[PDB]
Write an enzyme that holds these catalytic residues in place. Structure first.
Site, PDB file in Angstrom:
ATOM      1  N   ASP A  29       0.721  -1.015  -0.261  1.00  0.00           N
ATOM      2  CA  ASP A  29       0.173   0.114   0.046  1.00  0.00           C
ATOM      3  C   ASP A  29       0.687   1.178   0.367  1.00  0.00           C
ATOM      4  O   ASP A  29       0.201   2.766  -0.288  1.00  0.00           O
ATOM      5  CB  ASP A  29      -1.411   0.398   1.520  1.00  0.00           C
ATOM      6  CG  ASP A  29      -0.277   0.154   2.896  1.00  0.00           C
ATOM      7  OD1 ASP A  29       0.146  -1.204   2.805  1.00  0.00           O
ATOM      8  OD2 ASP A  29      -0.913   0.346   3.307  1.00  0.00           O
ATOM      9  N   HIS A  88       3.362   0.189  13.533  1.00  0.00           N
ATOM     10  CA  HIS A  88       3.067  -0.417  12.759  1.00  0.00           C
ATOM     11  C   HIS A  88       3.992  -1.523  11.933  1.00  0.00           C
ATOM     12  O   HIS A  88       3.905  -2.704  11.629  1.00  0.00           O
ATOM     13  CB  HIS A  88       2.121   0.052  11.813  1.00  0.00           C
ATOM     14  CG  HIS A  88       1.882  -0.187  10.138  1.00  0.00           C
ATOM     15  ND1 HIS A  88       0.018  -1.574  10.438  1.00  0.00           N
ATOM     16  CD2 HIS A  88       2.012  -0.443   8.677  1.00  0.00           C
ATOM     17  CE1 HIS A  88       0.551  -2.168   9.248  1.00  0.00           C
ATOM     18  NE2 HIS A  88       1.819  -1.221   8.550  1.00  0.00           N
TER      19      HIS A  88
HETATM   20  C1  LIG Z   1      -0.729  -3.761   2.743  1.00  0.00           C
HETATM   21  C2  LIG Z   1      -0.260  -4.656   3.999  1.00  0.00           C
HETATM   22  O1  LIG Z   1       0.647  -5.797   3.616  1.00  0.00           O
HETATM   23  C3  LIG Z   1       0.890  -6.406   3.898  1.00  0.00           C
HETATM   24  C4  LIG Z   1       0.631  -5.992   5.576  1.00  0.00           C
HETATM   25  C5  LIG Z   1       1.863  -6.511   6.803  1.00  0.00           C
HETATM   26  C6  LIG Z   1       2.163  -7.669   5.730  1.00  0.00           C
HETATM   27  C7  LIG Z   1       2.684  -9.279   6.712  1.00  0.00           C
HETATM   28  C8  LIG Z   1       4.088  -9.787   5.703  1.00  0.00           C
HETATM   29  N1  LIG Z   1       5.183  -8.497   5.163  1.00  0.00           N
HETATM   30  C9  LIG Z   1       1.313  -8.369   4.671  1.00  0.00           C
HETATM   31  C10 LIG Z   1       1.304  -8.002   4.074  1.00  0.00           C
HETATM   32  C11 LIG Z   1      -1.975  -4.848   4.002  1.00  0.00           C
HETATM   33  C12 LIG Z   1      -3.141  -5.900   3.689  1.00  0.00           C
HETATM   34  C13 LIG Z   1      -5.042  -5.783   3.761  1.00  0.00           C
HETATM   35  C14 LIG Z   1      -4.781  -4.643   4.944  1.00  0.00           C
HETATM   36  C15 LIG Z   1      -4.043  -3.727   6.034  1.00  0.00           C
HETATM   37  C16 LIG Z   1      -4.233  -3.163   6.821  1.00  0.00           C
HETATM   38  C17 LIG Z   1      -5.440  -2.599   7.712  1.00  0.00           C
HETATM   39  C18 LIG Z   1      -5.947  -1.411   7.789  1.00  0.00           C
HETATM   40  C19 LIG Z   1      -6.997  -1.421   8.450  1.00  0.00           C
HETATM   41  C20 LIG Z   1      -8.106  -2.107   8.894  1.00  0.00           C
HETATM   42  C21 LIG Z   1      -9.475  -2.129   9.979  1.00  0.00           C
HETATM   43  S1  LIG Z   1      -8.578  -1.595  11.388  1.00  0.00           S
HETATM   44  C22 LIG Z   1      -8.338  -0.602  12.312  1.00  0.00           C
HETATM   45  O2  LIG Z   1     -10.165  -1.313  12.333  1.00  0.00           O
HETATM   46  O3  LIG Z   1      -8.418  -3.110  12.311  1.00  0.00           O
HETATM   47  C23 LIG Z   1      -7.237  -3.898   8.166  1.00  0.00           C
HETATM   48 CL1  LIG Z   1      -8.239  -5.311   9.542  1.00  0.00          CL
HETATM   49  C24 LIG Z   1      -5.729  -3.626   8.120  1.00  0.00           C
HETATM   50  C25 LIG Z   1      -3.080  -2.456   6.361  1.00  0.00           C
HETATM   51  C26 LIG Z   1      -2.796  -1.671   7.926  1.00  0.00           C
HETATM   52  O4  LIG Z   1      -3.395  -2.099   9.221  1.00  0.00           O
HETATM   53  O5  LIG Z   1      -1.843  -0.846   7.797  1.00  0.00           O
HETATM   54  N2  LIG Z   1      -2.333  -2.812   6.210  1.00  0.00           N
HETATM   55  C27 LIG Z   1      -2.875  -3.747   5.267  1.00  0.00           C
HETATM   56 ZN   LIG Z   2      -1.445  -0.011   5.763  1.00  0.00          ZN
HETATM   57 ZN   LIG Z   3       1.603  -1.252   6.479  1.00  0.00          ZN
END
Ligand SMILES: C[C@H](Oc1ccc(CCN)cc1)c1cccc2c(-c3ccc(CS(C)(=O)=O)c(Cl)c3)c(C(=O)O)[nH]c12
Ligand SMILES: [Zn+2]
Ligand SMILES: [Zn+2]
Length: 232
Positions: free
Chosen positions: A89, A150
């Site tokens: 992202d 994060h």
């Molecule tokens: C882009 C990201 O890829 C990954 C991140 C980590 C890994 C592990 C290995 N390297 C792999 C891929 C990604 C993929 C899919 C989702 C996310 C979310 C996200 C954001 C908000 C919410 C709602 S909330 C605050 O209420 O929980 C949720 Cl559920 C998730 C975020 C983030 O938190 O920044 N990053 C995401």
């Molecule tokens: Zn993110």
């Molecule tokens: Zn991230």
């Protein structure tokens, strides 16, 4: 029609811009990951007769659409981009940017993590950000490394002309009920890193999370609260 655009309002592949302040926009796109659809934000900051981009639109095709939407809505060239951590992202679309004349930047930590994980890799390294509390100027913004949150490499961005704090994925929106994707997070250090942001940018008027709706300084305390309770 003027409201901050939300996940079910943006088909995957389309990008919308939102005016935050004079010379400051967010960009909003949506992407599928592991069978769910998510919104994400980035930033655009006017840099004279050029633009500075913060973060991709979460994928190559979304990022191409971002460039087209900028041309339509703003009409100034994007000349530089900064990615605020190594996840898709933030860097997915860097190759598109690099082929469209944009110079791409990230910290050395982000570049190493992107390379190791198989994500797209910004060209240029941003030195001077390796210790928590470090800050450097980059065009019309200040880049700040708050410490691990994060991710270990996450940067935040301040726009001093407008008192806009772009927290990226270290900052959650007020409706959040958990700390998002914490796979690469340091839940124990995250509140300390947020406190550093609060101390460094006490005059922030708008706070933009990595995902979801902007608000005010309360997003920082809310983030600390949700992260502590997640860890709990
Ligand atoms: C882009 C990201 O890829 C990954 C991140 C980590 C890994 C592990 C290995 N390297 C792999 C891929 C990604 C993929 C899919 C989702 C996310 C979310 C996200 C954001 C908000 C919410 C709602 S909330 C605050 O209420 O929980 C949720 Cl559920 C998730 C975020 C983030 O938190 O920044 N990053 C995401
Ligand atoms: Zn993110
Ligand atoms: Zn991230």
């Amino acid at each position: 029609s003027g409201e901050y655009p939300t996940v079910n309002e943006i088909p995957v592949g389309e990008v919308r811009l939102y005016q935050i302040a004079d010379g400051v926009w967010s960009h909003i796109a949506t992407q599928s990951f592991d069978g769910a659809v998510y919104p994400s934000n980035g930033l655009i900051v006017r840099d004279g007769d050029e633009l500075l981009l913060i973060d991709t639109a979460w994928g190559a095709k979304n990022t191409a659409a971002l460039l087209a939407e900028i041309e339509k809505q703003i009409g100034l060239p994007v000349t530089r981009a900064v990615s605020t951590h190594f996840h898709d992202d933030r860097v997915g679309g860097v190759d598109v940017l690099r082929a469209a004349g944009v110079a791409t930047y990230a910290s050395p930590s982000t570049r190493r993590l992107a390379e190791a994980e198989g994500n797209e890799i910004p060209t240029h390294s941003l030195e001077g950000l390796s210790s928590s509390g470090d800050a450097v100027r980059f065009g019309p913004v200040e880049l700040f490394y708050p410490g691990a949150a994060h991710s270990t490499d996450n940067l935040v961005v301040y726009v001093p002309s407008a008192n806009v704090l772009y927290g990226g994925c270290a900052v959650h929106e007020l409706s959040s009920t958990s700390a998002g994707n914490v796979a690469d997070a340091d839940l124990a250090e995250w509140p300390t890193s947020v406190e550093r942001i609060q101390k460094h940018y006490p005059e922030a008027e708008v706070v933009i999370p990595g995902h979801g709706l902007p608000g005010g300084l309360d997003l920082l305390q809310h983030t600390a609260n949700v992260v502590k309770a997640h860890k709990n």
